[PDB]
Write an enzyme that holds these catalytic residues in place. Sequence first.
Site, PDB file in Angstrom:
ATOM      1  CG  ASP A 151      42.457  38.893  33.503  1.00 27.64           C
ATOM      2  OD1 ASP A 151      41.231  38.695  33.612  1.00 27.64           O
ATOM      3  OD2 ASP A 151      43.201  39.112  34.480  1.00 27.64           O
ATOM      4  CG  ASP A 161      47.260  39.690  36.491  1.00 24.00           C
ATOM      5  OD1 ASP A 161      46.105  39.351  36.169  1.00 24.00           O
ATOM      6  OD2 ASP A 161      47.495  40.495  37.413  1.00 24.00           O
ATOM      7  CG  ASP A 212      44.005  34.882  33.477  1.00 23.19           C
ATOM      8  OD1 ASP A 212      43.090  35.178  32.680  1.00 23.19           O
ATOM      9  OD2 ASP A 212      44.222  35.516  34.530  1.00 23.19           O
TER      10      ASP A 212
END
Lengths: 268, 984
Positions: B337, B678, B682
């Site tokens: 990410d 985070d 996700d």
Amino acid sequence: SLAEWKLFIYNPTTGEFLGRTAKSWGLILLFYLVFYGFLAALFSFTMWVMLQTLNDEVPKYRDQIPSPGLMVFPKPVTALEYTFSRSDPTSYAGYIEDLKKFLKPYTLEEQKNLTVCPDGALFEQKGPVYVACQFPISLLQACSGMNDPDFGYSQGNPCILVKMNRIIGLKPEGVPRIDCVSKNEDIPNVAVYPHNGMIDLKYFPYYGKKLHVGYLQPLVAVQVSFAPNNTGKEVTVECKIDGSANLKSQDDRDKFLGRVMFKITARA
Amino acid sequence: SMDDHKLSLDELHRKYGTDLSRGLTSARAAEILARDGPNALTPPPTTPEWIKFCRQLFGGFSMLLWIGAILCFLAYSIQAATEEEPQNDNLYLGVVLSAVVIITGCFSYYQEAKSSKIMESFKNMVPQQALVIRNGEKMSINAEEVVVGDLVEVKGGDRIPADLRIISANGCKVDNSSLTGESEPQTRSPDFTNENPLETRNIAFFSTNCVEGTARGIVVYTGDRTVMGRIATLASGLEGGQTPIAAEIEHFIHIITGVAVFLGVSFFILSLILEYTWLEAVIFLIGIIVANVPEGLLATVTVCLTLTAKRMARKNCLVKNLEAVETLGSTSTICSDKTGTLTQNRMTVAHMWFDNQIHEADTTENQSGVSFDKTSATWLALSRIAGLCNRAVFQANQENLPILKRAVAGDASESALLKCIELCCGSVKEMRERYAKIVEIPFNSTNKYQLSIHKNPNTSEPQHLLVMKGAPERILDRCSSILLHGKEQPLDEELKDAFQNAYLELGGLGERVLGFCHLFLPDEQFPEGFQFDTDDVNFPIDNLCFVGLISMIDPPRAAVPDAVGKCRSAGIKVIMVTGDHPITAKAIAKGVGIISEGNETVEDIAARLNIPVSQVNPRDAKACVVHGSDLKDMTSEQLDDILKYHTEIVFARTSPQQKLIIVEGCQRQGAIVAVTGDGVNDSPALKKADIGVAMGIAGSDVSKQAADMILLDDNFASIVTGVEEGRLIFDNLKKSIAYTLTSNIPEITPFLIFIIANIPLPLGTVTILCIDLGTDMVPAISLAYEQAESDIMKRQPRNPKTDKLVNERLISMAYGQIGMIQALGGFFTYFVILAENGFLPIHLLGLRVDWDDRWINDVEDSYGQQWTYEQRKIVEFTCHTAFFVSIVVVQWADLVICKTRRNSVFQQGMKNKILIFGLFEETALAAFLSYCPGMGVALRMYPLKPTWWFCAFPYSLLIFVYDKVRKLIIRRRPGGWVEKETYY
Ligand SMILES: CC(C)CCC[C@@H](C)[C@H]1CC[C@H]2[C@@H]3CC=C4C[C@@H](O)CC[C@]4(C)[C@H]3CC[C@]12C
Ligand code: ALF
Ligand SMILES: [K+]
Ligand SMILES: [K+]
Ligand SMILES: [K+]
Ligand SMILES: [Mg+2]
């Protein structure tokens, strides 16, 4: 649902058998053959070196066999229990065969070479000749081969031999004897024939298989009688050594140390 | 799919039968609540802890030990029923085996995935209360009764209760970090803007909140039917699969179980051929089963994994699932990410254009980088303007914090300028104290600039200054001069062109650029007492003095570029999956090293060659940026083409389930994929990935619930440490498994020689249990402390299909060479003990029947002596003890040679102190078992004569010498036959 194994064996490409080719199979088998040959050679050499340090006459250690056990002959088929039928010769034929096979060295014919030794005295032999004392078969009167062809069988009074375990260089102290007693309250009479047990000291010490040629261990024979009409079966009789302090017979871990318990049952 | 922003106001209202302003009738609301169900997310059922332990109790070696315990009980029953004088040996053996199975099950239970509470975390995101219009009246109700098609009002930081179709909004903005991971507010308007419901402005999503403004909306989905509800259901339903270490463990469990079954059945049916009794056959089978099965192997693996996890727990890296330790080491692809994971999730000043020069400021959170020059007077003026035209203000009660890591009340841009000014020079509180603000005009939708008029720096009464910030290329349309090193000159055309170059260059780095300027009063024609509050005054703001340009970006973390470089050096393909816009994604990828220098995309090649993107051959470009819209309709086969041919991949504007699609596409090529994220978007990717890593400070609760590992300090070099430790623990597990498997042969061979040559048994079953459960535990664990033989970060990620933790070479080596040498040493010790007590080795052949006969008490040794049953049994148990001690002695050299696989044992030195203590503890435990009083009754261990300890010394020396010579041959000829057959 797929046979991935079928192609793995006998691969047409490269000719790989079970994932390895013919040349590599030969190499790996040759390597393992040579490796195991070298290992076997090293093991054999180490064994031979160990054996070279040993003595053929007397074992290096005797601390695990300090006192003699007590055993009966012949060995019954199951659980040291003697079972036979007086009217059936075939039941007690094995005992007869074993007894005659065992008592063959003890007869007068073969032990003519053996020498008579003075009684009641420990026979210590410092010399290298290591001659043996003779055990007359007449000492087991009524339980020996000379008196009758059947060792008490077919008469209702079977004969059983009790023998002390052989130990190299063991010198019993005192007067060793074997006493046999019935355990049940019916107390069928048991008669050790050579007077008492009376293991004679003149046969000790045992000097080994290699040195003391023609050794004949002292034998004690018992005769447990049964009535003609009354079988008197399931009699348990216990023999032990109680004349010597050196020979221990009160052990708990080992029930055969200095004593033996055996059972007799008779038919008709 | 299933869009509701298309319908008009009336068309939406008639579909749901809802009044525009009156709301929904209470009776209809109750009917719909009973018809559709409550507004809640349903937890997925969880298997009770009772079952999981039972599941662990029935795996591989556990079944063989269960068979052993059953046979022990059967043997005890047969013994009692037959000879009527039982010994409590087989019963105790069965009880001990059952206890061993239970303890091994406990160890397996510890080393297992501990499930996740993702659905509980989403239920913390639903509001407890909701403002709903019913019967034309506002009422606050429990959110669970909110139904479809009713007026819901949100405002002032309230979380959205359900997916809304906004029909009225007064300056409403929402935070869509649950769907996109990006925290910049998004405006909400009634009008239709975009086809996609996620990017359209009139839809408000569940699990989001209204940062500012008010909004009246219509519910379109409720409970599990919401967009984030389906994502939560998908994340809960997913599983991480089987970890690679679990697959390797199952593989060698299968190998060893197959060997054990083969030997057991073959020699059991052989014992039935030889007319063994049933009791004898089952005792022999119990011995074979115990000898073949490594009782302490799995517990050793669990302990090694736990120790490695504790090694990383010291480096602020928390490992939730014990198996995740080696997954990072086995990883070949990392999907990352962007925001919060690779970047700092904070808007920070990056570049400044002034003095006709570009100066780059420090963007690291720890301020380890160098700063720019503060010596310029126009820099002083620019800093004053930036820090004084700023509405944002620090929140109080946090003066004991680093400036960059302290909360600010204001916009992201305003806070970025505030923090930059604070770091660069002075403080903004004192800047406002010295320059009293006399009037200001805020940002406007039609003006696009903000100004503030206040007291001059020269302290003269007549002079005041106007400071203005705004868009870069538009603000100088009002300006006519510039400041250069404190000296003003008229606006030159060369200066204008240089400004344009600088604006495009800073903008080309994916940064928001802003222009700042000021103006002074010309003379006394405008007095200080004049009121500037007059709206629409006839005083145009023109002919200003342009001062500078400042750019802003969410910058990468300090250690992220070096970590990406190290991972790429380790052969790991690092892909970037983000929910942000493609330009920022590409800029961050170039900044952190996802896309290396000198490599171009197809669009960049087309721009270079001044041709349409269609004519560029797609094979030329090794990098690609794929937009989420393209990924949507793209088929699976086309996705696999993008992953295979492009080496630098960046996926942009990806929905939460598209991250899952990308992760599955990466895994489709047989790759171990590690996902770093985070946010809550996700979580499906973290669940599906082979290992999920979540950040500690910046991570959301959902992400750390869905992850296997947490970077507690948010240090991205912990990924490098984790992959290094995974490779190290894989190598050390090979070493430990080899050491544990080697000692099996000295336990299998005595039973086979027993049944073949009819010699007295050389080794007991309880003695075998004393070996594996005892002296073999600490040394085997000690291999986990071995250092790397070389730099393990240079080799490529291991192939799961090809590279096995236990291969044929390991089995071949341990079972065929070292095991056989150890067995020869043990058998030599056995023969020595028997020969020195009276039984010569030739006399032992065929003595099994009489030796084991409890009633034959005149067994004749080679010297004519006669032994009773107990007298010879003491010698046999002494032989068992000596065999155990010999196995310990050869395991000394086995440990030494297993310390390394390629290098010399004394080359690397004795850095491992645990291994020395393992040797000493193994020897001490052997001696204690041999010589402690009462061990003749407990384990049938007996004292050994001092000379009997040295019987196995020649074979240990042979093991050491053979391994040393083999290692020397390995290094001289790396491609030789020895390396292809012995190296594992
Ligand atoms: C007491 C004695 C007889 C035990 C002898 C064990 C021998 C025969 C067994 C035990 C381990 C076995 C080996 C295990 C591994 C390999 C490597 C494989 O690629 C070929 C088979 C081969 C080479 C096996 C050959 C046979 C083998 C060496
Ligand atoms: F933090 Al993101 F997509 F950048 F979830
Ligand atoms: K074992
Ligand atoms: K996972
Ligand atoms: K073992
Ligand atoms: Mg993020």
